[PDB]
Symmetry: D2
Subunit: 248 residues, 4 copies
């Protein structure tokens, strides 16, 4: 596979529906050696077994809200991989009350802080903590959403956090490029991981279907492989062309 010889850490695997699962799947298909993180001691067993099916028993706890947890995860990772070739950041959160109704009425100082901290800062917090561990030719990948670029009802403060995240992609690419690391995002179309949101995108997307975790995983695999050696700092739309049409 075109990831042979690569070791990639994959965050965000929570179930077989997770975008991160589809990415891990495609990467394993392409010959990558994988490691997995999990947020809390609840997902622990569930992720250990997803890992197993994908050639791996590197399953490590990490809450990205805490610098200590990120450090201790990469110290653990360093025991089996003193060096490695990048990671997939597939993590986001905002408090539930943030994401319903009029944006201005819903947003709070605290809601804004957590959304940005978990959905955007954590991407660079992970890069900081593993920087000396990355091989030349490493690639970092995060997952964004059209909410960054357009005002979408209910998406609310997550849109700001995703915009911060896409700028984070650019400043990371810029800072880490000279030492041979690429940094990109995929802006994915909607996937079941909102019933009206999915339905709308299907009717008006150029490809006339919603994208799958397989489509996103294949794009992800490519973007973390040396095939994409020419691509850095880019948000690639894997939404079947939805964002480039209007009034279909």
């Amino acid at each position: 596979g075109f990831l042979s010889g690569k070791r990639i850490l994959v965050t965000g695997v929570a179930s077989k529906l997770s975008i991160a699962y589809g990415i891990a799947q495609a990467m394993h298909r392409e010959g990558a050696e994988l490691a997995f993180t999990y947020q809390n001691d609840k997902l622990k067993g569930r992720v250990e077994e997803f890992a197993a099916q994908l050639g791996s028993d590197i399953v490590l706890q990490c809450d990205v809200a805490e610098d200590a947890s990120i450090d201790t995860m990469f110290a653990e990772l360093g025991k089996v991989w003193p060096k490695f070739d990048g990671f997939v950041h597939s993590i986001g959160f905002a408090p539930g009350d943030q994401l319903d109704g009029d944006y201005v009425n819903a947003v709070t100082r605290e809601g804004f802080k957590i959304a940005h901290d978990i959905s955007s800062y954590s991407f660079v917090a992970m890069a900081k903590a593993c920087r000396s561990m990355l091989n030349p030719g490493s690639a970092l990948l995060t997952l964004s959403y059209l909410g960054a670029e357009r005002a979408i009802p209910n998406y609310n403060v997550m849109g700001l956090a995703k915009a911060s995240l896409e700028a984070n992609v650019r400043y990371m690419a810029n800072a880490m490029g000279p030492e041979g690391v690429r940094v990109n995002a995929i802006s994915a179309g909607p996937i079941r991981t909102f019933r009206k949101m999915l339905a709308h995108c299907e009717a008006v997307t150029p490809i006339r279907r919603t994208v799958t975790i397989e489509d996103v995983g294949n794009s992800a695999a490519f973007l973390c492989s040396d095939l994409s050696a020419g691509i850095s700092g880019e948000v690639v739309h894997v939404d079947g062309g939805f964002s480039i049409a209007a009034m279909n």
Copy 2:
């Protein structure tokens, strides 16, 4: 002039060189009645003098880091302006260590938190706190910068906070549009007040850096009923710098 009849609150005046100052001068030139905030004790006197020179004695304390300080400022404002026509948000900050050197090395969780809180969250915090006071036809304005869109050396986490601020403009414009409020930003070129300035002078299509007068005249337009068809827009007032490459 073209803002006669409008009541506009102007934040962020700190000196005669402040963008907010060029904006307040331009708006007063166009007949706006103005009100002013100041952040702390150190700036109160400067802002009173500027306000007096521009016909105003509404000078109110406001530290956008705190919800209570925004709320009491608007309660104070409501005694003289029970309704008004919008505000200019000309505020941002990141701790000094954030803005020098390699971005990935410089940024910290706390530095990121403050940059976004002060430079982005505060725009919608002010809007939330005065929403019921805004007349139909109101306009809100904030100030952003090309670092929101491109990776600029040393700008670092402030680029992320400005990107969050630009999306805030879109989300606020969309939320507030139905009750008659527009929300825009000006992405200003760097203002001569250091290596970046010499660069922008040479390669900007109009062959100079923009001034606070340029910015102020665009800002007054964007807060006036002349810009009635413009909302959720980041307008580049950088002399065309951003749209050129390899000049």
Copy 3:
């Protein structure tokens, strides 16, 4: 008003509903002296009457399909305005068959050629033909549309021609900036004058379609010294429509 002292040429007036008409009214309201072109014999009378109502008797024929017609129009213009301050380009056309149905089936080599020639090339053709006549401080303006940026059904090859027109704005702004000329576009929302209009009304943040008055007030700003810090910009005057999704 804010265009006193400016001499601006206005193309594209065809009726009281023309965007160019709202623009000419707004500029005359702001003290500009105006000049007018008309495309052909059929429109001459309408444009003379409008010009007279707005204080002008400079009404000149110009078909931008031909180099000689642009050159003689500007030679005519130079007898009354040896120098002047810019022009509003409000011209586009594609043959009728281009603009209905599947894009790939509708477009032809000839239809593409004409759409780009008339709707894009003509902006720089006019600029070339009057370059030496423009005062420092001059501004050129053209009218574009969201189809330049997104695939819109039925707009078809006109979207490609508008994209070429937007890049023309950037290349002209960059070329002409050093001698004191700015060049911008307004990307106007669809104006009520059919299913698209009902759509834009419901989902546009300001909850209405923009009017030729909205467009005209932005255009007058962009041709005035108030927009001195703005060049090579496509400003969206569509009420925020383009920056929202799934409304």
Copy 4:
């Protein structure tokens, strides 16, 4: 390879330095069956032999200035491939006088017409002429340049033609998507196929090198493969992050 079972037409191969060559190379590496066009009876032998090295003796004359030539090329192609899975458009031209000096002084009605006709219209002229021949899952690819988005000295009217071309990508994707065809562009960084232009991009690009025809070919291969099934109507920057940095 991830193009196995695909048949792709590749235009624009003029020499071993051509972007189209690097694309053909990568595609053949990935198992695609190839066909090649050539502009004039001069390149004929030279292209026939490039083809041979890449598993192919489908080498067909085509001048994209002429509808008849495009039609007769696809009729010929139809003799060996009644159906096929898309094509690479790697064609552009403007008269030499267009591309030097002040844009406004250099541009002419005729220069503008030819630049747009050859660099932009020809992409959709090819799609029109082979539409009934495309399999579901087909992909079309063209090559653009940052000149479309920014004003670059000397690039002049080619910038307008490339902007027209990128809009063409979107309207094509929109029109052809429902019948199962994707359409994308790669905006490539500078490649030797200007000595100061290359040099500048090397110093200030995040990856600190200019991209190669191999980087572009690998991205091209991906974008014409089913791995990119989620991507349509997109201009992918394969310029090593150059366009997303400023003042480096």
